Write a protein that holds these residues in place. Structure first.
Motif, PDB file in Angstrom:
ATOM      1  N   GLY A  35       0.793  -1.214   0.000  1.00  0.00           N
ATOM      2  CA  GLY A  35       0.000   0.000   0.000  1.00  0.00           C
ATOM      3  C   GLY A  35       0.828   1.266   0.000  1.00  0.00           C
ATOM      4  O   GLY A  35       1.784   1.391   0.770  1.00  0.00           O
ATOM      5  N   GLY A  36       0.442   2.194  -0.872  1.00  0.00           N
ATOM      6  CA  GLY A  36       1.163   3.425  -1.114  1.00  0.00           C
ATOM      7  C   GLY A  36       0.468   4.619  -0.487  1.00  0.00           C
ATOM      8  O   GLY A  36      -0.763   4.709  -0.495  1.00  0.00           O
ATOM      9  N   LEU A  37       1.277   5.523   0.054  1.00  0.00           N
ATOM     10  CA  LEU A  37       0.821   6.776   0.622  1.00  0.00           C
ATOM     11  C   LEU A  37       1.795   7.893   0.308  1.00  0.00           C
ATOM     12  O   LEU A  37       2.971   7.647   0.080  1.00  0.00           O
ATOM     13  CB  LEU A  37       0.686   6.662   2.135  1.00  0.00           C
ATOM     14  N   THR A  38       1.276   9.121   0.301  1.00  0.00           N
ATOM     15  CA  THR A  38       2.073  10.287   0.017  1.00  0.00           C
ATOM     16  C   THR A  38       1.577  11.527   0.757  1.00  0.00           C
ATOM     17  O   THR A  38       0.537  11.495   1.435  1.00  0.00           O
ATOM     18  CB  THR A  38       2.113  10.532  -1.502  1.00  0.00           C
ATOM     19  N   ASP A  39       2.326  12.616   0.619  1.00  0.00           N
ATOM     20  CA  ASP A  39       1.901  13.943   1.092  1.00  0.00           C
ATOM     21  C   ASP A  39       1.593  13.964   2.595  1.00  0.00           C
ATOM     22  O   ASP A  39       0.497  14.301   3.028  1.00  0.00           O
ATOM     23  CB  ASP A  39       0.685  14.468   0.306  1.00  0.00           C
ATOM     24  N   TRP A  40       2.593  13.593   3.381  1.00  0.00           N
ATOM     25  CA  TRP A  40       2.485  13.473   4.830  1.00  0.00           C
ATOM     26  C   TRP A  40       2.471  14.837   5.513  1.00  0.00           C
ATOM     27  O   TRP A  40       3.449  15.561   5.447  1.00  0.00           O
ATOM     28  CB  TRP A  40       3.670  12.664   5.365  1.00  0.00           C
ATOM     29  N   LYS A  41       1.358  15.168   6.160  1.00  0.00           N
ATOM     30  CA  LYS A  41       1.246  16.334   7.032  1.00  0.00           C
ATOM     31  C   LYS A  41       1.810  15.944   8.405  1.00  0.00           C
ATOM     32  O   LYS A  41       1.877  14.745   8.719  1.00  0.00           O
ATOM     33  CB  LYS A  41      -0.203  16.759   7.172  1.00  0.00           C
TER      34      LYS A  41
END
Ligand SMILES: Cc1cnn(C[C@H]2C[NH2+][C@H](C)CN2CC(=O)N2CC(C)(C)c3cnc(Cc4ccccc4)cc32)c1
Ligand code: NA
Ligand SMILES: [Zn+2]
Length: 106
Positions: A58-64
């Motif tokens: 699983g991919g994730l991006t743009d971490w606040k």
């Protein structure tokens, strides 16, 4: 995007070890902590702050800075067996409940 891996076998065994995941980040400028990411199963792709879980893929991006690796892992990849092994279904349910409730107030 590819379907999420829901088996007990990791999609990327080369990234099963914590230390292997750590090496992928290099110098990390992003708001989210790299060791925290590695602990939550994530390794860096080397474009921006995109990460992938070694197990579910699983991919994730743009971490606040308010976004927690484990919480996001659960939000978006709830079938992940690595997540279930490490955190338990009790944790996983509270996270789901919490997110699915946050919407109500929003
Ligand atoms: C683009 C996108 C969609 N939602 N968000 C909000 C952010 C907020 N920060 C959070 C830490 C994560 N959010 C969700 C997110 O990152 N998701 C949700 C999903 C599963 C639809 C998705 C798909 N594909 C990408 C891209 C990708 C990343 C790694 C490898 C390959 C491709 C990201 C992404 C960003
Ligand atoms: Na890098
Ligand atoms: Zn996963």
């Amino acid at each position: 995007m590819n379907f999420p891996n829901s088996t007990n076998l990791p999609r990327n065994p080369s990234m099963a070890d914590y230390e292997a995941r750590i090496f992928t980040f290099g110098t990390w400028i992003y708001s989210v902590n790299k060791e925290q990411l590695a602990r939550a199963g994530f390794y860096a792709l080397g474009e921006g702050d995109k990460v992938k879980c070694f197990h579910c893929g699983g991919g994730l991006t743009d971490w606040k800075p308010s976004e927690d690796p484990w919480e996001q892992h659960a939000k978006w990849y709830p079938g992940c067996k690595y997540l279930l092994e490490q955190k338990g279904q009790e944790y996983i349910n509270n996270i789901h409940l919490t997110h699915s409730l946050e919407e109500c107030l929003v």
